[PDB]
Design an enzyme around this catalytic site. Structure first.
Site, PDB file in Angstrom:
ATOM      1  N   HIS A   1     -11.707  -6.604  -2.105  1.00 20.88           N
ATOM      2  CA  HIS A   1     -11.348  -6.223  -0.770  1.00 20.88           C
ATOM      3  C   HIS A   1     -12.500  -6.438   0.179  1.00 20.88           C
ATOM      4  O   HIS A   1     -13.589  -5.916  -0.023  1.00 20.88           O
ATOM      5  CB  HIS A   1     -10.876  -4.797  -0.755  1.00 20.88           C
ATOM      6  CG  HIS A   1     -10.465  -4.361   0.524  1.00 20.88           C
ATOM      7  ND1 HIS A   1     -10.630  -3.091   0.928  1.00 20.88           N
ATOM      8  CD2 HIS A   1      -9.874  -5.013   1.536  1.00 20.88           C
ATOM      9  CE1 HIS A   1     -10.176  -2.974   2.154  1.00 20.88           C
ATOM     10  NE2 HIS A   1      -9.717  -4.138   2.541  1.00 20.88           N
ATOM     11  N   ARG A   2     -12.279  -7.251   1.206  1.00 24.29           N
ATOM     12  CA  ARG A   2     -13.332  -7.595   2.146  1.00 24.29           C
ATOM     13  C   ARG A   2     -14.013  -6.342   2.656  1.00 24.29           C
ATOM     14  O   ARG A   2     -15.228  -6.248   2.727  1.00 24.29           O
ATOM     15  CB  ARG A   2     -12.727  -8.327   3.323  1.00 24.29           C
ATOM     16  CG  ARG A   2     -12.182  -9.673   3.007  1.00 24.29           C
ATOM     17  CD  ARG A   2     -11.676 -10.408   4.210  1.00 24.29           C
ATOM     18  NE  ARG A   2     -10.506  -9.804   4.798  1.00 24.29           N
ATOM     19  CZ  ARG A   2      -9.821 -10.337   5.823  1.00 24.29           C
ATOM     20  NH1 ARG A   2     -10.185 -11.487   6.339  1.00 24.29           N
ATOM     21  NH2 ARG A   2      -8.774  -9.697   6.312  1.00 24.29           N
TER      22      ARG A   2
ATOM     23  N   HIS B   1      -8.898 -10.770  -0.583  1.00 19.49           N
ATOM     24  CA  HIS B   1      -8.246 -10.682   0.704  1.00 19.49           C
ATOM     25  C   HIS B   1      -8.747 -11.754   1.632  1.00 19.49           C
ATOM     26  O   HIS B   1      -9.945 -11.947   1.802  1.00 19.49           O
ATOM     27  CB  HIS B   1      -8.439  -9.307   1.319  1.00 19.49           C
ATOM     28  CG  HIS B   1      -7.550  -8.257   0.782  1.00 19.49           C
ATOM     29  ND1 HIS B   1      -6.301  -8.059   1.273  1.00 19.49           N
ATOM     30  CD2 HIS B   1      -7.702  -7.369  -0.216  1.00 19.49           C
ATOM     31  CE1 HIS B   1      -5.722  -7.075   0.625  1.00 19.49           C
ATOM     32  NE2 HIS B   1      -6.560  -6.626  -0.298  1.00 19.49           N
TER      33      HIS B   1
ATOM     34  N   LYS C   1      -1.336   8.323   3.151  1.00 18.33           N
ATOM     35  CA  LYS C   1      -2.584   7.903   2.556  1.00 18.33           C
ATOM     36  C   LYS C   1      -3.328   9.081   1.958  1.00 18.33           C
ATOM     37  O   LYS C   1      -3.550   9.150   0.754  1.00 18.33           O
ATOM     38  CB  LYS C   1      -3.448   7.252   3.620  1.00 18.33           C
ATOM     39  CG  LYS C   1      -2.959   5.950   4.161  1.00 18.33           C
ATOM     40  CD  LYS C   1      -3.902   5.500   5.286  1.00 18.33           C
ATOM     41  CE  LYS C   1      -3.519   4.147   5.886  1.00 18.33           C
ATOM     42  NZ  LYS C   1      -3.796   3.030   4.939  1.00 18.33           N
TER      43      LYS C   1
ATOM     44  N   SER D   1      -2.540 -10.167   4.190  1.00 19.26           N
ATOM     45  CA  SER D   1      -2.181  -8.813   4.547  1.00 19.26           C
ATOM     46  C   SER D   1      -2.385  -8.552   6.014  1.00 19.26           C
ATOM     47  O   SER D   1      -3.214  -9.194   6.660  1.00 19.26           O
ATOM     48  CB  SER D   1      -3.043  -7.832   3.797  1.00 19.26           C
ATOM     49  OG  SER D   1      -4.369  -7.901   4.250  1.00 19.26           O
TER      50      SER D   1
ATOM     51  N   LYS E   1       1.767   4.887   1.611  1.00 19.58           N
ATOM     52  CA  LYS E   1       1.671   5.770   2.741  1.00 19.58           C
ATOM     53  C   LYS E   1       2.578   6.950   2.373  1.00 19.58           C
ATOM     54  O   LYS E   1       3.651   6.713   1.821  1.00 19.58           O
ATOM     55  CB  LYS E   1       2.123   5.075   4.022  1.00 19.58           C
ATOM     56  CG  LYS E   1       2.015   5.931   5.274  1.00 19.58           C
ATOM     57  CD  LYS E   1       2.400   5.159   6.524  1.00 19.58           C
ATOM     58  CE  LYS E   1       2.263   6.031   7.770  1.00 19.58           C
ATOM     59  NZ  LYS E   1       2.621   5.286   9.014  1.00 19.58           N
TER      60      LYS E   1
ATOM     61  N   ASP F   1      -5.511   3.158  -1.247  1.00 17.89           N
ATOM     62  CA  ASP F   1      -6.118   3.010   0.064  1.00 17.89           C
ATOM     63  C   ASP F   1      -7.623   2.826  -0.127  1.00 17.89           C
ATOM     64  O   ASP F   1      -8.232   3.496  -0.967  1.00 17.89           O
ATOM     65  CB  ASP F   1      -5.837   4.192   0.973  1.00 17.89           C
ATOM     66  CG  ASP F   1      -6.230   3.866   2.381  1.00 17.89           C
ATOM     67  OD1 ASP F   1      -5.372   3.422   3.129  1.00 17.89           O
ATOM     68  OD2 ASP F   1      -7.383   4.010   2.715  1.00 17.89           O
TER      69      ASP F   1
ATOM     70  N   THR G   1       0.835  -1.176   0.000  1.00 14.70           N
ATOM     71  CA  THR G   1       0.000   0.000   0.000  1.00 14.70           C
ATOM     72  C   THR G   1       0.875   1.233   0.000  1.00 14.70           C
ATOM     73  O   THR G   1       2.046   1.171   0.368  1.00 14.70           O
ATOM     74  CB  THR G   1      -0.907   0.010   1.222  1.00 14.70           C
ATOM     75  OG1 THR G   1      -0.103   0.073   2.407  1.00 14.70           O
ATOM     76  CG2 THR G   1      -1.722  -1.251   1.233  1.00 14.70           C
TER      77      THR G   1
END
Lengths: 415, 195, 418, 416
Positions: free
Chosen positions: A262-263, A295, A147, A342, A145, A173, A143
């Site tokens: 993505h959950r 994920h 963000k 993750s 950062k 993000d 990811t």
């Protein structure tokens, strides 16, 4: 009426949909009565052809006032190709039923006859390996950062550095779809440029977030990503909805764009152990709707996690209660979904992750002491070291500290 | 890793050459890949080096291990004289069974001339059999015979099915064509033909 | 505790949220509070916890009040607001359990949303129905009926006196009944029952569908047939699809009914998840003219609390009713509540007094079939409304109000044979 | 060869099964021939067909049956054309066999559920037409003529009492009559008839066309004009076009009538080609609400078809031509259409043979409307007699003679 929705002698048909629930009945209510009630409320509350039947009830070992119930539902009750209809029927209002203190759905067996009415993943594991030309190892990413508060240009620079440095994927993000400080159209342009100027000599991408407030806006964003040549996009299916997810998945198949799921909200639904819907159910539902990546989260219960990872990757999974699999599930050659690990992970944990998930996975990492490209390098090195070692037959749990260009060293030295 | 008694005194390049030349039978060089791996070897690189893809390497190793577990126990030499050219893919599906029931399953699978699908489903009838402790007619199918485990699977799948309809009967006729005890036979005859 | 400021006053543009939680033993409320803010927001972009008041009575149970800057949210998007506030804050180890109790939407954000396609006053004008609550029912048998026989049941029920008939939320399109045929036969039933009474009637055709395109096809067909109202499941289908349908509805003039199937999964337990009142506010912003609230007689205060939140223009905070923050809706139209579950004419008095006039009552088995069914409910409601207008006490005289009406109506007299 | 003939294989619930009849070349064993068919029709050891059973045809020399299983994975979801190239693409040209015929196919539920099936199906079709308790009637217009005069003939016949009137299957669009006008004049005839009689009447407008676009234009116009039903030739036009039209019909609420022209080319000879029961199943999966099956006034084979295209579940019964038990998994049936050589004298038999779920398409009456009248009366008389308990195969002569006294139109027909 209270009973007859519980038939202990019934043997399920190959075309039945089966569901496994855990529950705790209100004091005064018998386990069988509660089981029959679940079947009735979830199916009818020639009707004998349209009713569910509880066929088996057993106590949960080690738990007071805690039982399992296994309920069959006729194939005819489910709209072809629709996750939304399946859930609407099964979990629609049974959870609000008064004779039960709590109810949790543990598993669903989808009969082949129903599985074949669904699209499944746009591409799946083998197709994706070929599209990306990446073999013999897990894929890596991270990811970005900071963000929030970055200009599209600065964001693009961060993406560039990480991808050039050695990662396969960079992720947006989840909280930034379009914001007053950054509008998606510019994020998409600058990210695409970062990919262009990096893509090394190998395919790279970025999980552009196309989650949007309307079906039209979602397509609009997805179409732009297609115009820019983006190989992959992402979507937050539990906050956006299965209807939207399914639509996007069909679009993706037609346009050749990999889909990342993505959950993004699951802790709301599956965290507590005595109420709601177990993630493995949602994972199966998603495999039927669409999505190439999902994920799963990390491991580093273990058994339960391993259980659903096989359910979403394998063609045929034998029932095994110790891993949380209640029913044998035949996927009828529908392609699997790559798990994405993750949270709480570093190069330090790479050995375990490689051994636990095998090659068919993606490992996403959240900083490195020297900017970002050395970060990417440290992860790329750590992964290759782990894969080669596993290929050599080394014990990645015991030799992990030996298995793990000073970039990696800087990371290992920090921790 | 253990090496066969013949190649105990070769280096890594000797292993590489005997792998790339196929200069043995599969159960003679499958242990060798495993030993070779320890001395610096990767299967994707080995596809460039020897030239066998990773799925084939894994299948070979597991098949040789299953064959050793079979041959080290009670048997007759005919099937090991039959597992000499192309027995790896079939030995790869019975790896789910413990060493006791392995030699019993091998006879069934090589006598009926079954492929990977039937072998996967059969080992499964055996693996699913134990946790059906209470059922209809469970103790009439014995455990130490694979045909009876498969027959019990078929019988239970047709047991509370639709009234005949040549679907329940069809599964009954499938179950009768594989059972090999006598209580199984007279029970399935009681079921399919006359009360 | 860089995310916890004991002395902070929220800005008029801040979004506020109220959480309830129980810390793991060893974790101070202060840390849990700060953690919720940090996990949900990450200085101009960070959330801030500003109050961590304990809940009375319960042990190891606290509240946390967190402010979030306006700029963390996408204009017009419920999906985004929820992703930002509730996506992963429910998943970390410091807290045993977490529940979201309330959200204050600042005016500056409320104005970026469409809101209900029509709203309560417009909806009454379109239907030309005033003074009283509206009535409806559903159809039994649910599963296994042909489209034609289904259409006959719809006709009889509507002809008999109901305003609306509702599709089983579980039947979108199934092998035993396809949606196109249902839509045609239902539409015929409406057109005939409407023509014979001289008054607008509808049916909540279910346009829930597996894809956005299929959803539109179903909605478009309902429009072609002249159907005044359609329904959709906002939780199972989700908000992206729901918002899209609501926009379509405004453009086309079709009223939208929202079912709350699967809400129990999210809000049944009182110590984890998201309270319905939050979902109700979110829906008012996304769209929908009618919303299932559920009944009271077939917690009372918390129910009344959200009913006001989704109908009134301005609601003062009142913790005894479950309202944590004062909410100014900035003249956005309200959502008409729909009461249901365990109700029949015996409860008519209470339902009228509890919900007032701006509501829909969805009933249900009558001894003489469907039109008598509809007749009995129509009479019971009118009798109750008129008594309330006179000044009679529906919570005490309700038994007599129904019996006097029953003497007048054989259908009601039969219905009251309980 | 031994990698295909496997005498000890039990078919899976997901397998597609096929039954072939063949006559091997002299010198070629039956088993080798069966193995060869499985090989030619398939292939990766999971992508091959298997021949699991071979038996002689009772009473015939050099005549055998072979039963071959095919894995589900080999068939494109929802596609009749893929199933057919796989099963019948090249086996018929195979050199070791003198002749080959396909007798039957078992479609596994897993595959059945990937198909649309009939647009509306039998029960829906009755509800749409609001016609219950009896077979439906129609006829083909003769002369098989301007659009105006054609429209008049259609009007009179529908007005007279038939439920449906049919276009000649060979007239699409010709110099002497262009479809656009036939459609306008027929639609007028229908609308006047419906307005006058209060019933629902249709006409099987032929929308068969040289191209897909033209096919759609014809279908769209029929919808614009309010036509409840359209016609198409599934064999000549083929399955890609048929399937396309069926999808259109389901989306648009139009019933689809399927004609079987050119089937004789494929199945007339008992020892070569594809039996119509196979084509009938294929069509049920592709689309079509109505299907010509033809009348019998082989009876056993005919009865076989009718159950296969109407019932939810058909048990195997070799004496009726059904080789495999077929579970349709709640897909709706196709309403059979009887035709060829029929007039009122056969009405008793037709009612008893096909029951209520059927359409009877009649040929010439000595007096158009009197024709419609004679058939409408004859049918109602037969149905009522059946419900009362008369035996139509024996009392049919008296049922018609009595009915003939109620309406002189029927007497006139019976008199010839």
């Amino acid at each position: 009426y209270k009973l007859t929705y519980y038939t202990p002698d019934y043997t399920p048909k190959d075309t039945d949909l089966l569901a496994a629930f855990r529950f705790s009945p209100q004091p005064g209510v018998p386990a069988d009565e509660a089981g029959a009630a679940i079947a009735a409320e979830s199916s009818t509350g020639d009707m004998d052809r349209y009713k569910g039947k509880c066929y088996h009830i057993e106590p949960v070992q080690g738990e007071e006032n805690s039982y399992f119930a296994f309920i069959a539902y006729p194939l005819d009750l489910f709209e072809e190709g629709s996750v939304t209809n399946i859930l609407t029927s099964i979990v629609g209002n049974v959870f609000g039923f008064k004779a039960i203190r709590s109810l949790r759905l543990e598993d669903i067996r989808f009969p082949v006859a129903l599985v074949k009415t669904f699209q499944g993943p746009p591409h799946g594991i083998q197709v994706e390996r070929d599209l990306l030309n990446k073999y013999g190892r897990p894929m890596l990413g991270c990811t970005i950062k900071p963000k929030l508060g970055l200009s599209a240009k600065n964001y693009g620079r961060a993406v560039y550095e990480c991808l050039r440095g050695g990662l396969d994927f960079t992720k947006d993000d989840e909280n930034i779809n379009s914001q007053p400080f950054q509008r998606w159209r510019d994020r998409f342009l600058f990210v695409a440029d970062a990919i262009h100027k990096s893509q090394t000599g190998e395919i790279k991408g970025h999980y552009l977030n196309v989650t949007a407030p309307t079906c039209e806006e979602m397509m609009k964003r997805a179409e732009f990503a297609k115009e820019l040549g983006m190989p992959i996009i992402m979507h937050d299916f539990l906050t956006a909805g299965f209807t939207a997810n399914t639509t996007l998945a069909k679009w993706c198949r037609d346009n050749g764009v990999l889909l990342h799921i993505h959950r993004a909200m699951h802790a709301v639904i599956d965290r507590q152990r005595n109420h709601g819907i177990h993630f493995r159910v949602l994972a199966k539902c998603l495999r039927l709707s669409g999505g190439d990546h999902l994920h799963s989260g990390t491991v580093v219960d273990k058994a339960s996690t391993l259980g659903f990872v096989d359910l979403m990757r394998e063609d045929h999974i034998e029932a095994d209660r110790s891993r949380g699999v209640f029913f044998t599930q035949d996927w009828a050659s529908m392609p699997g979904v790559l798990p994405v690990a993750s949270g709480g992970i570093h190069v330090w944990h790479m050995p375990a992750l490689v051994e636990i998930f095998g090659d068919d996975s993606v490992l996403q990492f959240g900083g490195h002491p020297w900017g970002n490209a050395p970060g990417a390098t440290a992860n790329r090195v750590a992964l290759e070291a782990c894969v080669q070692a596993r290929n050599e037959g080394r014990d990645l749990y015991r030799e992990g500290g030996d298995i793990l260009s000073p970039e990696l060293a800087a990371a290992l030295d920090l921790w | 890793s253990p090496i066969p008694t013949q190649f105990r005194s070769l280096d890594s390049a000797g292993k590489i050459e005997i792998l790339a030349g196929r200069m043995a039978l599969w159960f003679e060089y499958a242990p060798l890949i495993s030993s070779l791996y320890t001395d610096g070897f990767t299967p994707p690189t080995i596809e460039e080096l020897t030239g066998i893809s990773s799925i084939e390497q894994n299948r070979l190793i597991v098949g040789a291990q299953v064959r050793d577990s079979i041959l080290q126990s009670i048997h007759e030499p005919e099937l090991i004289s039959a597992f000499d050219t192309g027995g790896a893919e079939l030995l790869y599906e019975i790896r789910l069974l413990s060493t006791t029931q392995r030699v019993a399953a091998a006879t069934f699978i090589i006598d009926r001339n079954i492929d990977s699908k039937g072998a996967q489903d059969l080992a499964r009838a055996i693996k699913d059999y134990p946790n059906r402790r209470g059922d209809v007619g469970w103790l009439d199918f014995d455990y130490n015979l694979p045909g009876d485990c498969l027959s019990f699977l078929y019988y239970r799948q047709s047991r509370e099915n639709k009234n005949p309809s040549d679907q329940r009967t069809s599964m009954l006729l499938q179950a009768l064509g594989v059972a090999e005890s006598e209580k199984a036979k007279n029970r399935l005859n009681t079921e399919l033909y006359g009360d």
